[PDB]
């Protein structure tokens with residue numbers, strides 16, 4: 242029953258500061274413009290110890306599967322090759338991506354009927370709000 246409140250299909254309903262987050266990460270102009278326009282769904286499922294997170298949009302369809310605390314290699318939607326570890330910290334899914342001596346953290350949390358995603362790169366934070374589809 243790890244992660245029960247995250248499981249389901251979620252749709253993006255608001256975004257703040259996402260372009261600036263992407264700039265800080267190093268995403269190029271054209272990808273920022275097209276990715277920033279995306280209205281993704283996020284589909285989260287659990288089977289045993291394996292969590293799967295899919296992101297589906299007109300820009301890209303991506304999927305990660307992982308076990309909490311166990312590092313994995315990820316190719317991000319902007320084509321970074323990163324080493325990722327996802328843990329549960331006080332009910333928050335904390336996703337750390339490492340590449341080229343850099344690091345970014347993406348947190349997913351349940352707040353009321355929303356799934357709130359906070360993306361941090363150095364001092365820049367983007368907040369993305371999803372609701373059930």
Ligand SMILES: CC(C)(C)c1cc(C(C)(C)C)c(O)c([C@@](O)(C(=O)O)C(F)(F)F)c1
Nearest residue numbers: 276279281296298301317318319358360369
């Ligand atoms: C949906 C899409 C492809 C625009 C997208 C692209 C990225 C980048 C480019 C890797 C920064 C990203 O981080 C996120 C996400 O962080 C968000 O919604 O905030 C995630 F992962 F939660 F879906 C979405």
